Structure formats: C-alpha cells, structure tokens
Amino acid sequence: GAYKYLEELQRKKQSDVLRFLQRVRVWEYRQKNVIHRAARPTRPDKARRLGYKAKQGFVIYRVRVRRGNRKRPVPKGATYGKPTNQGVNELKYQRSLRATAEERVGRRAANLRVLNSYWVNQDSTYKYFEVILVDPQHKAIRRDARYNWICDPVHKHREARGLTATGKKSRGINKGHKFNNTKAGRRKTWKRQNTLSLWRYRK
Amino acid sequence: EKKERLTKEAAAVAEGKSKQDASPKPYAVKYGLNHVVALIENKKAKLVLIANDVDPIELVVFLPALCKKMGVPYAIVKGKARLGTLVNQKTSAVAALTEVRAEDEAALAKLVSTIDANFADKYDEVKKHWGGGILGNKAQAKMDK
Amino acid sequence: KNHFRKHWQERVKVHFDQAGKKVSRRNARATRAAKIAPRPLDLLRPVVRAPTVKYNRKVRAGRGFTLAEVKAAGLTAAYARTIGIAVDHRRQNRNQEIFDANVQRLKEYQSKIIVFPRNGKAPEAEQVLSAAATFPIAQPATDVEARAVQDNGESAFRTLRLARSEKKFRGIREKRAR
Amino acid sequence: VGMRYFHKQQAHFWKPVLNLDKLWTLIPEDKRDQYLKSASKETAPVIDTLAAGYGKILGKGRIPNVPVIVKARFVSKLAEEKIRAAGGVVELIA
Amino acid sequence: VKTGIAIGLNKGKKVTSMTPAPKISYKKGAASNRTKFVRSLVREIAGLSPYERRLIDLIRNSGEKRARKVAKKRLGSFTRAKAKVEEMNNIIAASR
RNA sequence: UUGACCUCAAAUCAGGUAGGAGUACCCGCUGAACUUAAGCAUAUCAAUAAGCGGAGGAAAAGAAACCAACCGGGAUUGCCUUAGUAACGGCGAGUGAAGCGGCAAAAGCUCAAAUUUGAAAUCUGGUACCUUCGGUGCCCGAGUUGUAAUUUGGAGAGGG
RNA sequence: GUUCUUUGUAAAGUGCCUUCGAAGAGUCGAGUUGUUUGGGAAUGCAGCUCUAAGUGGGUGGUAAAUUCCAUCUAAAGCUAA
RNA sequence: UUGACAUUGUGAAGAGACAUGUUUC
RNA sequence: GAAGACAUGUCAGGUGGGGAGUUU
C-alpha cells in the first residue's frame, strides 16, 4: 500500500516537497499553544509502526519544547565549589528533549499512558514531537489482549521512569560490553559492585 | 442490505443445498487507500479518484505519480467527503472502480478518455513550473504604482 | 591494595540467610514438584562443547536442542516444548558428532517418557524429580587406554616450529611472490 | 613500562606445563605397575595430557625405558627427544 | 579444513562440519521488487537534495576525488561517501 | 436555500481517570562539600550526601545490530570464580569490571510492514432480557488517514 | 472422579514442487563541546552541525587506506522464577 | 562584545563558471 | 503602522576581582 511511499518519502526531508511542508507546519505549530491535542497523527506510517491503532482509546498529542543547553539553577552561575564545577553554560542536560516532551505531555495527560513518540519538526528555538498515548480506562483497551498489558499499574508513568524507547536509549540499556556500566542499571550496577560480600564462613 | 443478503445466503446454503455461489457477483467502488494502492501496480483498477483536501498531503502526493507510472486513469476530485458520501463513509480520500457492468462500459470509456486528456496529458508539463506567485491586494496595489 | 576509602559500611551485606535461603529453596522445590507432580521438574538439555579452549576439552550441557536436532529426532519444536524438551533456535549445528549425540539423547528421552492421554484415565505417575539425573552428561572417550606404537620420525616439535614460522611470513611471502 | 594489552583476556594464555617427572603419574595406579611391567610397543599406554588439563609437555626428569603414546598440544625440544629415546611417540592434538 | 594441531593457519580439531542451514536474518539486507520500485518512485518524485545537487555539480566540474572528499566531509563515513558518489554518477549518466 | 466533511468551543451533560501520603528496595533527573594527595587546582571523596519526578511486593532487565575466534557459546538476573588482573590515574594518593568455568531458576514470544475486496467480517456506548467480574436482540457512534484473521526473520507468505 | 453437551462436520501440524520474502529515518553514522567510565588515538550519555544504503547495517577493545573472514539485525513491544 | 553554523524566504542588473536548467558574490 | 532575511540555539576569539576555589 502507501506504507513504503510514506516511509521513504519522509526520509527525503531535504527534498523541496518536504521543505515547504515543514516550513508551513512549523509556523502553524508556532501559532498554536505549547501543548495541544492533534486530532489525527500527521505521520500515520510512523505512528502505525510504533503501536498506534486507529480506534477508540488512542490519543495523539503535540508538544513544543525548547532546545539547547540547560543553565544551572543557581544565582549568577556561582556553584560555590571547586573550579571544575563552576562550569554552567556548558551543562548538556543529559536527558534528551524527546524524553522531556514525553514527560510534559504525560503530566498534562496523567490519565493516559505514554506509549511512544516520534519527531515531526524542529525549529531554531523549539523542537516538535508527536506522542502516542493509550487510555487504560477504555473497555476496548482493557478487553484487547494486545494492549491490556499496559493497564497494569506497573506501567504507570512509563515516560517518567525512562521505560520508553527514547528513555531507555538515554539510560544506555543495551546488550554487549560497550554498555557494561549501564547493562543492568547504572545505580544498581554501582551498588552491586561496591557491596562487600561476607558469608558466614569467611573465604 | 447486508443482513438480508446474509440471511438469504444462509437459507440458500442450509436448505437450498447451494454452494454459496447463488448470490450474483457484486459490483462496487473500491475505496480503501491501502486497498486502492495495492489494486494499482496490478493494473486491475479502471479509474481512480483523488481528494485534494487531504490535510496530510503526503498520503496522496505519490498517488498521481504512481498512477501515471502504471498508466491508470487517475482524477483529482474536489472534496474528500463527497467521496465518502458516495461510499457510505464520512471520508475516504480515494475512490476507484474495478468491475463495471457492460451497460456502463461506454460511459466509463468516455469518462476515462476525458480524464486522460484532463490530467494525464498535463502531467508531463505541470511538473516543471511553480505556483504560489500571489500577493495581497494592498501589496499588489502599492507595487503596481 | 584495599578499596575502603568510601562509605563501604553502608553497603556491607552478611549472608546470615544462607541456611534460611537454602531451606526456602528446598521448600520451593518441593512446592513446585507438588505443582509439577506428573513431570520431572526440569527440561532435558542437549550435549554441548564449550568455547575458550581452556574449557573446550570438557563437554557441557546446552540451553536447548536446535531446530534441526528436534526435526531429526522425529518431532516438532512446538511439540518438543510441551513434551519437556528444551529447544534453542539460536544454536547452530556444525558438528556431526555432537548432532548425533543430541539426536540419540532425544530418542532415548522420548523412548523413556510416558505421555498420558489428554482424555484422562492417567495411571500412577511416580515422577522422578530430576530428568538430568536419568540422562547424565558423559564425556566422550578421547582415545583408548593403549595402542600399538607407530612413528615416522617427523619430530612433532619440528612440525610445531614449522607451523609457527609459516604463519608469520605468509603475508610477506605473498608480497615477495610478486 | 612494557607494551600494553587492552582487554587481555586470560583464556589466550592457558598453557599449563607438565614435567616428565609427573607424566607417568597420570596413568591410574591400578594399571601403572602392569604397564611398567608390560612395556612394549604392541600395547603401549596412551596418556591424553589434554584430558588432564596440561598444555605443554616439558622434560625435567628421566622417564623409564617404556614406550608411551603421549598426546599433547605442545612439547619441548628435549621432551620429545627423551620420549623417543624411551620408545614412545609424541602425538599432537587440538 | 582444520590442520588438527594447536597452531598454524587452520589450527583446530578436525570435525565433520555440517554446514548448518543459512539463517534468514542475513537476508534482511537483500532488496525486494516492491522496495526497489517504491524507492525509485520516491527518488523521482523528490529529486535531488541540495547537497546531492552540489555533489553532482562538483563531480561534473572538478572530478570525483574532490566530490568524494566533499561527501566524506558531509556524510562523515568515508565508506558511505563512495556509495553516495557512485549513485550520484549513476544519476548523472541517467540524463544521457 | 438545505444537508454534509475538517478544525475549534460550551456543557453542575452520561460513563471515567489524575493529584496526595508513604518512600528501607527500585527507575531516572539533579547534585556538592569535608577529607585524601601530609600545601593544592587534574584527580580522590563521587558518578556519593541533600533536592526533584515515577510504581509495585518486589522493581528494573529480558528473549542478542551479545560473547567469542572456539571441536563454538545461546533470554534476563543473582552467588563463587575470573580478580584486586587488564586498564586508568600531576602512573600518586587511589580506582577498577567482562567474556569462559561451577551453581541458584528456567518460558516464551508479538506489532508495523500482504488487497478479505465475493462482501469492516472489528469495536466503544445506549436500550430490553438473562444464568450478571459478563452474554444475547436492536439502535447510534468510532472506524477505509485501516477496526477483524495470518505472518515477526527461529522464520513466514501466494499457488500446485 | 461425577454429571449436561458434542463440541465441528470449524481450527491447528507435518511431506515435496514452485514464485516471493516487505522487517522500524532527524534514525545509524561523522565533527565539535560537556559529563562519565578501567575504556587507553576517545566506554557510555547529552547540546549544536551534517546526515546516510539496502546481498545493506552493527560488532569483532590501537588511529588510517586496501581485501577477506566470524556472529547478530538497532532505530517497536509484553513476560513469572 | 565579535566570528562561524540553522531561523535565511522571493525578486533585476554587472561579475563570472557550467549545462542543454544550476552556483557565486 | 514601523521594520525586515537584519535583529533574534551551539562552539570559538576578546573583556571581565562584578563573583567563586587555591597559593603567598
């Protein structure tokens, strides 16, 4: 069908066809509020492969989030410490903007569970993302074995705990030797490796 | 109509010892976007209709070019709802004919011939010029002087 | 060299529950056996040869039989899982000896198990709490105890030196050839 | 000081050495005496040193004049000569 | 075939390599008829991006070496720069 | 002139959900200094103290764009071991795990990507009944900008 | 175990021939900066810039070019011990 | 405080360079 | 109405006891 025409065409972001659409849509979103609900997904191909289904219980939200470094929350940048810690402007905000947007939309959509999100536009001062959310209160979702799993309370505020696709990437949750410090939790790994095991019969 | 048709088929099968072929072969306009696209590339569809008011234009930008590549009659029709009302849906954004009775073949052929001269011929030339060269009334009046 | 320049006291863990954990594990095993009364509490595992030549000499148990091994054994992977045979799709088979040993193990396991009909009327089971115990892993015999002595005067040490030398200059030899 | 070795896994350097003095001790005691008495090339005992976890055979003692079929991954220059003098053959395995 | 010794170019134990069946996952790279047609259609619809236009102009006016260097500077990966230059040259040749 | 489609509003509309407390354990963000190097800024303290957000009896992770270079290993997690080693460090104070091996326990899998097109076959909600953690008949609505069945690479699919 | 139905004339599996095999994009990756790790000519994470192809892509603990080789298939998701 | 990178679109002439419509001031 | 591809996130150069750490 149109799956591959949509997917491949979206990849040609530098094409003149997509450039005009992006220029129009960034302005259109700028004329709107920071956070607002999108009636239908603007990228059905991207949302569809992310688990979105065109039925009651799925909501699409649009959010605008600023970009750039994060200024330290101290007066006049004075960290009051060693010189190495005095750096303020270069702080990099180790959480991706996508995760922040997902958290913000979840806070505004606390009754909905953040499932995933995809990039839709960018701006010099702001970045735009589209978030797919699922309502656990709807009987259709609860009665669907393919999505009722999210109804469990263990999935509450998935974006807040970094359980989303973007959140896991920021946490470095991946197999292999390259992710040893974060293969199974950075803090958990640090605590485990720093524990002094002492059995009844000392070895 | 579907309820009555299903009841008639069930009766004809259970008591009429039929083989589900009693019902006549149906004729209807194919309208699914994915269904229409899949029908194309097989050269089974005879006519294709395209709605120009699709807000996510990317969904239908490729369809005219794909139809031209496959050489299928395609037409851009104003209003997606009009297609929906024609197909008992709120909106469809697309409509295409696959099977047509012999009685309407002549009218279908004439319509296809007209559409080809309307859109297919202009495809080779519309691709090489840019629109949107319009300005506001105040700006136009000020610059004209 | 001691790493104690941190707040290690807050992370000290003493395994007082070693006996308690052992009792819980024994109790948990018995509880599952009661739940798993008809079955042997575990899935039969294949014969596997280890990497890391330091250990390749020793045969080891694998995660599960390969799809090819299950097919050769005369059943299906889906049926094998319900019968109690571990299946591992990731493991490839590139050794005739290991594949044949696994096939023989599967055939023996199938011939030694009794499957009660799904229509009830199942007789007494008298389960065995360990399937691996009934099919212990046996190291294949590398060679017989004694053999007739034969020699060729090749100076096996000389062969090793020649092999070591050849690998070093092969790259330079190929360049010198042109 | 010396050349560095990133990710120097120890599996590469597993080369446990076996002295010829302890080579004859690998045979079980139940048959060691019999083999020492039945020393011949017809039924010389086979000592798979790899099964015992010994990588390279090294010569330190003087094994008796008994033909022994020794299989090992590596052997020293003197070890093979001494084994051949004793009447054995140094086989190679991997 | 392993030599059967602990050293050499083919060190290792001699075994009857069964040569297991090819894993399908290796076939992900292999293209498909539908994907090829869709990619060609999308390429003709979109045309050439500004960087692709600059690359083809540089290829035409100053040779491939400078174009390859520019592609490496843009795409970063030198290995992908070769493929980019090759496809740009194919597009250029398609005109004639 | 009338009826539709799309967006956006109002509802003390009918049916729902969210705040907060607790917070020993977990998942993230943020985040110092004392001290140490007999001074001290790299560095150590520490990816810790404090602060912030998010749930449960466990949480996370989880079925490899992994480890190995082997006669191959085969979800994830934990213990012993690797190992106080590579390696890092005004190579100083000091920091420092992983592959193999033994054991604890074992479970698999499913979404997009196919035209069902001789049949949107899907589902929320309202109503009457009933054997009421729901089912049946009927009626609106969601849905073709894709709701049903099949397939998830181990494979898998159209035909004979 | 017992009792009320025959569930369905519906679903699933295996054998051979044949044509296919779609598999995730502001993502992978590169430059710079910040932080971090034992990770060392840059282990992981993040801001800015550029921005990819499908017999392709990732990894193969020393940077770079050339040519092979070994294993998986990321940018989607659930799951007790 | 200054330089560079995206926000930066669409228009003539002079300066040129290519191709058979593109790039620079 | 004025203005306009100029003003207006990331690096780099300059100034910076206005502020922080340390030495004497």
Side-chain angles (χ1 to χ4, degrees), chain A, chain B, chain C residues 1-120 122-123 125-178, chain D, chain E:
Chain A
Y3 68 107
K4 196 80 210 172
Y5 298 92
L6 267 87
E7 185 171 301
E8 196 67 19
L9 183 60
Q10 196 68 23
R11 293 172 183 201
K12 322 301 172 179
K13 301 180 159 66
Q14 316 224 326
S15 63
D16 281 321
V17 57
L18 259 65
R19 184 158 286 183
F20 168 79
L21 266 50
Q22 179 264 322
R23 185 134 51 203
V24 170
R25 286 177 178 165
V26 68
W27 170 90
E28 194 208 307
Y29 305 156
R30 276 207 301 279
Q31 300 322 301
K32 281 181 175 164
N33 284 120
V34 161
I35 290 137
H36 67 85
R37 168 160 181 184
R40 61 182 69 265
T42 57
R43 295 179 54 195
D45 63 304
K46 183 69 187 201
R48 178 161 196 74
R49 63 167 149 278
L50 287 170
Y52 161 80
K53 279 283 177 157
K55 65 184 182 177
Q56 295 155 314
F58 294 80
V59 179
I60 305 288
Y61 254 82
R62 202 168 294 141
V63 53
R64 185 176 86 229
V65 295
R66 277 190 183 231
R67 79 195 287 202
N69 302 351
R70 169 179 55 86
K71 206 159 178 176
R72 193 162 267 166
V74 295
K76 292 183 282 191
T79 309
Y80 283 97
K82 270 144 158 56
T84 292
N85 296 319
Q86 291 179 351
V88 170
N89 275 295
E90 309 296 304
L91 203 53
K92 282 292 127 64
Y93 183 54
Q94 317 303 346
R95 278 286 284 287
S96 60
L97 301 171
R98 190 175 154 200
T100 307
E102 281 178 356
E103 291 226 50
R104 285 183 176 179
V105 65
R107 285 214 309 282
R108 183 137 179 170
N111 64 298
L112 300 324
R113 275 85 194 275
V114 178
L115 178 61
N116 264 315
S117 64
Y118 49 96
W119 179 90
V120 294
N121 210 322
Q122 67 172 40
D123 190 64
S124 41
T125 312
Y126 306 91
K127 283 209 189 179
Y128 308 83
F129 295 90
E130 196 148 279
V131 180
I132 168 56
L133 309 112
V134 180
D135 186 13
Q137 283 71 233
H138 217 267
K139 287 281 159 178
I141 305 302
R142 300 169 74 79
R143 290 170 172 190
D144 193 355
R146 297 188 171 74
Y147 294 91
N148 64 342
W149 55 265
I150 203 169
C151 303
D152 216 273
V154 291
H155 295 109
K156 276 171 181 175
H157 280 281
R158 263 167 93 272
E159 79 302 336
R161 287 176 289 152
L163 309 185
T164 53
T166 187
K168 291 178 89 166
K169 207 279 197 290
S170 309
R171 291 162 55 204
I173 302 299
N174 275 304
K175 288 167 178 163
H177 80 277
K178 311 199 91 75
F179 313 99
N180 287 335
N181 310 138
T182 167
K183 196 194 289 184
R186 209 288 316 293
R187 285 175 186 73
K188 182 157 173 285
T189 296
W190 177 89
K191 173 163 170 265
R192 190 192 76 225
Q193 73 196 24
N194 283 258
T195 291
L196 178 65
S197 172
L198 300 168
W199 289 88
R200 298 191 302 163
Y201 303 96
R202 303 288 152 79
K203 307 177 81 69
Chain B
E1 297 175 78
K2 169 151 187 165
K3 297 287 182 187
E4 184 258 309
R5 206 282 320 294
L6 285 167
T7 51
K8 184 178 170 187
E9 272 181 17
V13 174
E15 318 310 299
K17 50 79 170 175
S18 86
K19 318 188 78 169
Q20 282 182 341
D21 294 339
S23 286
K25 173 160 169 175
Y27 298 79
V29 190
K30 280 67 168 68
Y31 55 109
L33 212 160
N34 282 288
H35 183 208
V36 164
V37 173
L39 280 154
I40 310 152
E41 311 171 351
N42 296 22
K43 304 192 75 155
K44 275 194 170 185
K46 308 298 192 71
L47 213 154
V48 169
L49 303 184
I50 291 158
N52 65 355
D53 64 330
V54 177
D55 161 71
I57 317 191
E58 302 104 281
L59 276 156
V60 71
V61 293
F62 72 93
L63 215 153
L66 185 272
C67 272
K68 176 58 176 177
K69 186 77 81 169
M70 289 295 104
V72 181
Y74 81 95
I76 292 158
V77 71
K78 242 188 175 182
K80 68 182 84 74
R82 211 172 167 196
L83 297 170
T85 59
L86 157 68
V87 85
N88 320 341
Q89 298 294 340
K90 284 199 294 186
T91 56
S92 206
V94 278
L97 288 153
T98 302
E99 295 283 9
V100 161
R101 280 179 263 273
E103 64 188 87
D104 297 297
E105 205 77 54
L108 170 56
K110 193 180 195 293
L111 194 64
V112 169
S113 173
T114 314
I115 285 159
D116 297 339
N118 295 135
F119 294 116
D121 296 4
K122 277 65 165 174
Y123 187 96
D124 294 76
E125 59 86 24
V126 71
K127 280 261 199 177
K128 297 188 185 184
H129 53 62
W130 296 46
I134 294 154
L135 287 168
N137 61 70
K138 303 196 186 187
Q140 182 174 331
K142 200 139 280 187
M143 74 188 197
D144 287 347
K145 265 67 183 297
Chain C
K1 282 180 79 178
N2 278 102
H3 307 74
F4 289 110
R5 294 171 85 266
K6 289 176 178 183
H7 304 320
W8 63 273
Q9 285 130 315
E10 305 182 10
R11 278 89 71 170
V12 177
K13 193 173 81 181
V14 198
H15 300 265
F16 295 124
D17 61 349
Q18 179 170 44
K21 279 184 143 65
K22 187 178 178 186
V23 178
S24 303
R25 286 184 241 110
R26 290 192 80 257
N27 289 341
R29 281 197 282 279
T31 299
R32 185 152 102 78
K35 185 187 184 84
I36 306 287
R39 326 199 254 122
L41 201 86
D42 43 28
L43 316 177
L44 194 275
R45 293 311 209 285
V47 160
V48 151
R49 196 154 284 278
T52 73
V53 295
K54 169 174 181 191
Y55 297 107
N56 79 337
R57 85 205 187 209
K58 288 287 187 165
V59 163
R60 185 170 57 73
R63 193 205 159 67
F65 292 85
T66 75
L67 304 172
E69 283 167 358
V70 178
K71 195 162 190 163
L75 69 159
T76 44
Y79 184 47
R81 292 198 165 85
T82 62
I83 287 281
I85 291 155
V87 183
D88 181 19
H89 62 85
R90 309 181 203 73
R91 183 160 135 275
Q92 326 308 330
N93 273 116
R94 58 180 73 74
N95 197 358
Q96 189 64 19
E97 284 76 1
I98 291 281
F99 164 81
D100 184 85
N102 283 311
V103 169
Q104 183 57 31
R105 195 184 174 79
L106 286 173
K107 295 306 299 299
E108 284 163 10
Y109 178 83
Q110 283 178 104
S111 82
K112 262 185 180 183
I113 60 171
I114 56 178
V115 186
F116 304 125
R118 260 191 277 174
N119 305 290
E126 208 187 64
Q127 55 150 332
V128 181
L129 306 184
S130 179
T134 313
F135 312 92
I137 299 287
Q139 303 291 321
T142 57
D143 213 327
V144 291
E145 201 165 35
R147 281 201 275 100
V149 175
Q150 55 191 351
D151 200 353
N152 53 6
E154 276 288 2
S155 176
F157 170 75
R158 180 61 171 169
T159 305
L160 287 163
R161 194 74 177 165
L162 291 163
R164 211 74 151 280
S165 177
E166 167 159 25
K167 183 167 168 282
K168 182 177 168 74
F169 298 108
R170 179 150 172 281
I172 306 179
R173 281 163 175 191
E174 292 299 327
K175 189 167 81 79
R176 278 165 174 162
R178 54 153 167 278
Chain D
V1 181
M3 60 180 74
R4 281 175 293 166
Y5 203 138
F6 310 147
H7 191 54
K8 188 186 172 282
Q9 52 175 321
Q10 212 70 248
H12 291 316
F13 304 95
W14 181 81
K15 194 162 281 192
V17 303
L18 176 65
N19 293 113
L20 277 176
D21 269 310
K22 332 299 276 287
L23 184 273
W24 254 96
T25 69
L26 308 183
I27 296 167
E29 173 54 28
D30 293 4
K31 309 296 184 281
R32 205 183 301 154
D33 298 332
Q34 290 199 304
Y35 282 122
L36 288 164
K37 158 165 171 74
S38 71
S40 61
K41 289 193 180 186
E42 288 282 271
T43 58
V46 192
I47 310 182
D48 194 349
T49 67
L50 191 69
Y54 299 115
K56 185 170 180 180
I57 316 307
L58 303 182
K60 194 172 161 272
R62 298 190 300 194
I63 54 164
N65 203 57
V66 178
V68 184
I69 297 158
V70 173
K71 320 210 296 186
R73 288 183 171 167
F74 298 87
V75 281
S76 74
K77 185 179 156 198
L78 211 152
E80 176 164 36
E81 294 168 359
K82 212 179 291 210
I83 293 155
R84 283 173 165 285
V89 287
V90 177
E91 296 190 342
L92 299 178
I93 38 68
Chain E
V1 177
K2 295 295 203 291
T3 44
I5 44 165
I7 44 169
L9 294 147
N10 289 296
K11 65 192 179 180
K13 173 79 174 193
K14 274 172 68 170
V15 284
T16 315
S17 56
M18 291 191 75
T19 312
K23 255 166 74 78
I24 311 101
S25 53
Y26 311 149
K27 310 304 301 308
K28 181 174 169 190
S32 42
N33 310 137
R34 301 175 64 198
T35 47
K36 285 169 166 282
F37 177 40
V38 174
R39 284 157 185 173
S40 170
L41 205 290
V42 175
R43 166 58 74 175
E44 62 174 76
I45 273 172
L48 306 175
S49 51
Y51 94 91
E52 277 172 322
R53 212 182 302 123
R54 204 169 293 284
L55 255 292
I56 58 167
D57 292 352
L58 263 288
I59 293 162
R60 279 172 168 161
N61 289 275
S62 190
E64 286 193 48
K65 201 181 193 293
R66 181 165 173 160
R68 276 153 185 279
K69 191 165 69 177
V70 176
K72 169 172 180 282
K73 187 174 179 72
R74 283 270 172 173
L75 308 189
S77 271
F78 183 49
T79 183
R80 302 171 194 179
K82 299 199 188 83
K84 180 56 59 169
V85 174
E86 186 246 316
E87 63 175 43
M88 288 296 105
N89 277 273
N90 299 344
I91 282 279
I92 291 158
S95 183
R96 298 284 84 194

